[PDB]
Write a structure and sequence with these properties.
about 260 residues; mainly beta; Carbonic Anhydrase II; 13-stranded mixed β-sheet; two-stranded parallel sheet; 4 helices; globular; binds decane-1,10-diyl disulfamate; binds chloride ion; binds zinc ion; EC 4.2.1.1; EC 4.2.1.69; Carbonic anhydrase 2; lyase
């Protein structure tokens, strides 16, 4: 009985094996655009993905991960609410069975068709492992996806999904440039949160971009063709692999824009 997104192992069940699920700084959260406050103290955000090196893509039975070589200081995120340097280790998506849902974070309760998460760990901690043991060990850049025009930079990921249909499958995936997944504006909302999947560790400084990127219906449709199950097992389409908004509690969401 592993955690998942179904009726018996979904988000409402996670708290049992991971009690932190009802903790003080859980993610995602609804972003009330009116209560969020512009924060002058925020330094401009710096996203340097020019030397990013993807290695492979994997279907972990929950979503698919495009992994990067974080052994050197290549793809890094800095500035903004962040202190020091954060290194890109991987990115993945959360999407729905329908365009009307899929994103984890919401803006004034609005749910986007999907959400992109670029995961980075604080280099002051050496590696990813030691970083997820720190309140500021991680920084995740979240980008909303809506259905409309196709996103050219995403097609390479799309055409490769066929090779990793089922849980456990992986395929080499080099030279993928994540800069092709970024919207025009770096305007964002930021707050202290956690991983949205178990172990739901509260080590994350979330940075959610205001401007969503648009992908085509055909692109998101292929995401939906993926499987939760492993090869040779009953087909369970990989859809609605998103955790709903959690209590904001003792927190304030700051805006990088006025
Ligand atoms: N293997 S290790 O010791 O180096 O580290 C274990 C960490 C376990 C947790 C891994 C979590 C990885 C991110 C999952 C998605 O999070 S989200 N959706 O972006 O909030
Ligand atoms: Cl199901
Ligand atoms: Zn995620």
């Amino acid at each position: 009985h592993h955690w998942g997104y179904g009726k018996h192992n979904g988000p409402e069940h996670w708290h049992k094996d991971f009690p932190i699920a009802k903790g003080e700084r859980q993610s995602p959260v609804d972003i009330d655009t009116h209560t969020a406050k512009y924060d002058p103290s925020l330094k401009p955000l710096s996203v340097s993905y020019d030397q990013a090196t993807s290695l492979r893509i994997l279907n972990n039975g929950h979503a698919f991960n495009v992994e990067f070589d974080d052994s050197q200081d290549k793809a890094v995120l800095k500035g903004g609410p962040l202190d020091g340097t954060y290194r890109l280790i991987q990115f993945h998506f959360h999407w729905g069975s329908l365009d009307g849902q899929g994103s984890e974070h919401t803006v004034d309760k609005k749910k986007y068709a999907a959400e992109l998460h670029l995961v980075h760990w604080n280099t002051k901690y050496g590696d990813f492992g030691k970083a997820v043991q720190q309140p500021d060990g991680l920084a995740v850049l979240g980008i909303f996806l809506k259905v409309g025009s196709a996103k050219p930079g995403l097609q390479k990921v799309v055409d490769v999904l066929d090779s990793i249909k089922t849980k456990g499958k992986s395929a080499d995936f080099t030279n993928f440039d994540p800069r092709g997944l970024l919207p025009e504006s770096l305007d964002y909302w930021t707050y202290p949160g956690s991983l949205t999947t178990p172990p739901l560790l509260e080590c994350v400084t979330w940075i959610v971009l205001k401007e969503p990127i648009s992908v085509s219906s055909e692109q998101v449709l292929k995401f939906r063709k993926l499987n939760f199950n492993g090869e040779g097992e009953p087909e369970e389409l990989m859809v609605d692999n998103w955790r709903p908004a959690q209590p904001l509690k003792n927190r304030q969401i700051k805006a990088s824009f006025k």
